[PDB]
Symmetry: D2
Subunit: 330 residues, 4 copies
């Protein structure tokens, strides 16, 4: 009997993991500049763990991530599923938590899909991307990684696509699942999994994007003292399918913003109350009578995460009670 | 002799209820201070606004020598904004301490009473002076610049997430170990004594496939400033970046902040702030950056002078 | 059809939840002074949620918690299981994380067992114990609480008995599951569970304490710069069954301490390497060759938690590989 | 002109490897300083000890005017202890910065290089002066009193868990926003210049059913001090409490600390410290409390004077 390594596919999309600057010590750099091959070759030990094949999907900063790249990824994973044992997606850190949740809801492939990035560019002293990529390959290769939904692997930690968020602007340790914690820790190329997400993911969702050319239009508005209603009115004037509110506290809205969203909701715009507060649920049965206005409470989904779910909810239904039920199940 | 402490009530879950009722509900306040209450407004802090800010700064500044310290009762939702506004505009050199409650007055294990007691402890402490406007919540004294609401329901929600608290309160005493270095109160140029309105500053949000429609609506209204809640280290979605690049050369100040809950939006990363005429917010989150941008716009419209204000206060 | 409330039993053991002082505003108090009845009557709304029956088991500060009270609790729960729908145990906060883990390993009753305490005494302004107790009753009454092991409920949060630990000396928010996060959050008397512990608990362990009169002797030694070997030698001289090391960093030992524990291990004393560091695993395959010395790595179990498991391991076996396997499964 | 910076190497994962190799591996150090390296010892910091502490304090104090600042390379396991010892005993008014690495030198994405660079940045910054002994790890400047190792393997492990960091390091610059209030360095009475050994102080651990055998072994050896790693707010298991109550009246100083990772061990809770002659450690964790108790025992054996040292440093 001979040892055979898993086949792992790296789908590259850009990010600081592929960024470069002209000094190892200066902070200035440009994103999404280095190709997949360079990234693979910067981690010689990948041969110890897997047979790795790189595909460049796009090469962008994830600040410019968009619906089309999401659709491209989910269809590619779902199409290529039987050709490989696992997927790693190199990606910018800025919107990784959004892509990860989109994929967590739309991937039907039953093989691990692991996202990874780097907070320091590839050119920098003590660059994090090499060891991150190695650890993402470890996770994508591990049989025990299956059936946990789509994953993010950063700073020696396996995180679920739903709860994972970027907590700090610069720290290599930025990614945390701030409400429910990580799924497992990685040491010496091995994972001790102690948790799995309970919310329904991947092949247990009704979201099927195989045939979609676009996603429903959903925007985000912020609340704060003396908040203008102009952002909200602009989305309503443009025929937006949905609006997510980054509320204050427990999903609360500045009155002007409330009035514009209450009206929009009456016309059939889906409105989700979320919170600019970085941890904790936007609950039902607090200061906003959601049933009355036809609003939906986002639970622990932050505004960018709630947008993902809301867009996907809007592909199945425009009924707010059914959208609320979706927000309670996925 | 006990210190004279004034409670300025503004609403919030800590009260709907009047200043007099909240005082009498904590009779042990009489052990530590002579408290007088005045009702400024009575609103949920989700409806906090510039007019209330101006009223508060003006009242503290004018009433400063009639009392030994102030406590401001406030909703928790925007307490972090009001605290930083007052941090930059209070000229009174006596402690100003904001407090709220995450549970209702009538709920099991309501936090308001002890929160109020400890806010008065803090306002009455001579060591609390010259530390800027403060927030006291969950036995902790927090500086008004860094303090933010971190959880939607936790009594322990308020934290100074970048630089930590100033001291902790135990048995009615504070062991202070820190003070903020950024200039505050009477060390700032902001003087709101004769202003009846503040520059219009709005906040836009970045995310994948972000619409430029919000940013355009602010530009079309002739907003004096726009704060971006960027992705990561203050980054902008291309459509948003395009609109703001235009606003910055067309009479609208642009501050890059971040939707990310901790850490600075830095210069010298991916964005050439000098080329576009943008200002990096540092550790000021979007709502905090709005406060400081509104006040900077009372002094100057020049990006470089705004960037220096953002580096000093 | 008529609504019937669950039957919940409160087993009282003491703690600050039952403490009292002479002022609502001064910090001084005495622990484990108030009886169960007073605690129940301080939460009038308990009638809305359950039929509550209180039993005083002991009335102590949990700084004086001990093996006999553990045995008393586990046997009482296992004996009384069919007489009630759920258990709440009021307890001091200081060693709640140890009792909770002991019960998580020894309770065979398939009904919820929820521990609760209070960081402020019952007499204090804004005392936390009333709402904590209410929330613990909510959790013990919830059908969805079953099969999650033994729980701690504090500060509106449901925490698993294994990972839960006291993080701060005074804060009402002190209890956190610092490695893997909480199981669910409580809002308006309802729980949204998103996680369950993967490590084996309750009726899936081999630990059966029904017949035990005592537990094996296991002590804890601390490491630091210039650490004395005298604590370790004292436990070895007394015939201790086990010793847990609160190591520095990744379970490392000051050399004098290492030498004494290496020798003890050769004579059949079980030695577990844990860490004084508050989060993260004490791993295998780092700076200590555990196989060589016959030592056991504690994983994420902190020293007091590792003591619990080690004592229970020693009731089944004295073989270090088998003890290591236990530390990898429970 | 670049500042002269001295690296004093002591071992740790950041190196086994010599001071000269570690320097040459980060050639960009030449952009910011003139670095000279000296090997003090070469050990895993799990074997750190009093002799090394004394060597380091003595060397810095004596070499202070020959250089512009010091960086000390050290294992991470007990860096938090060494930093606080030096915090209390360094009399040199130039920056002293400790640094280590959580990953080996030869591992993927080793943290040591950038950690070292940023430690030199910090040591070279004029603004770093008069802030006490520092720890620089993961782009963060941490005070030596509060800093502790919070995770067994994370590169981001070091945090000042009670009062937060002093500043963050970006693009070779520090934006300092805090400084420690507790007295340090040249504001302390501790003078180690002529000492060749330190008072014997041991640490005992509390947990359910705790043995008194460790505490008794220290008492029987005539230890000068015992620090208790208490449960909760510095509480003691009855057997341990009994033994320590005896030690405190029999020539052994007793400090109550806590195994709990954050927050103070307070007076005025469950334990009558005055009655027993005990000292409460405040936010000093057991290993930190040992450092300060050893140094207090060089000045006094009196519990009340020890309690005042614990309240000031
Ligand atoms: N702007 C970069 C940041 C990073 O990857 O760290 C991106 O998200 O593509
Ligand atoms: N909505 C309330 C929340 C609170 O005070 O806890 C307010 O901010 O006024
Ligand atoms: N010493 C008390 C502390 C508390 O309950 O909060 C106990 O553990 O019993
Ligand atoms: N055992 C090593 C750990 C490290 O340096 O990361 C030391 O402290 O010397």
């Amino acid at each position: 009997h001979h040892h055979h390594l898993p086949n792992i596919t790296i789908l590259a999309t850009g990010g600081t993991i592929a960024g470069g600057g002209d000094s190892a010590t200066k902070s200035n750099y440009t994103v999404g500049k280095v190709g997949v091959e360079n990234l693979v070759n910067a981690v010689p030990q990948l041969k110890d763990i897997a047979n790795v094949k790189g595909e460049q999907v796009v090469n962008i900063g994830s600040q410019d991530m968009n619906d089309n790249v999401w659709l491209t990824l989910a269809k590619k994973i779902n199409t290529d599923c039987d050709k490989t044992d696992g997927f790693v997606i190199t990606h910018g850190t800025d919107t990784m938590e959004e892509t990860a949740y989109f994929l967590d809801l739309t991937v039907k492939c039953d093989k691990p899909v692991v996202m990874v990035g780097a907070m320091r560019p590839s050119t920098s002293m003590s660059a994090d991307g090499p060891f991150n990529l190695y650890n993402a390959v470890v996770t994508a290769a591990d049989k025990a990684s299956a059936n946990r939904g789509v994953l993010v692997v950063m700073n020696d930690t396996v995180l679920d696509g739903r709860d994972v968020t970027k907590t700090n602007t610069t720290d290599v340790a930025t990614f945390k699942s701030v409400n429910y914690g990580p799924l497992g820790y990685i040491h010496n190329g091995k994972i001790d999994y102690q948790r799995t997400p309970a919310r329904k993911h991947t092949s247990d969702t009704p979201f099927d994007v195989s045939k979609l050319n676009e996603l429903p239009k959903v925007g985000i508005v912020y609340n704060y003292a003396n908040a203008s209603d102009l952002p909200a009115k602009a989305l309503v004037d443009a025929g937006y399918d949905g609006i997510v509110s980054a509320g204050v506290g427990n999903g609360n809205l500045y009155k002007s913003v409330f009035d514009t969203l209450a009206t929009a909701a009456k016309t059939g715009t889906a409105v989700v109350r979320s919170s600019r507060v970085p941890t904790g649920a936007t609950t039902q049965d607090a200061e906003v009578d959601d049933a009355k206005y036809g609003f939906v409470a986002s639970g622990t989904l932050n505004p960018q995460k709630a947008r993902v779910l809301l867009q996907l909810a809007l592909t199945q239904t425009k009924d707010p009670q059914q959208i609320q039920q979706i927000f309670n199940q996925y």
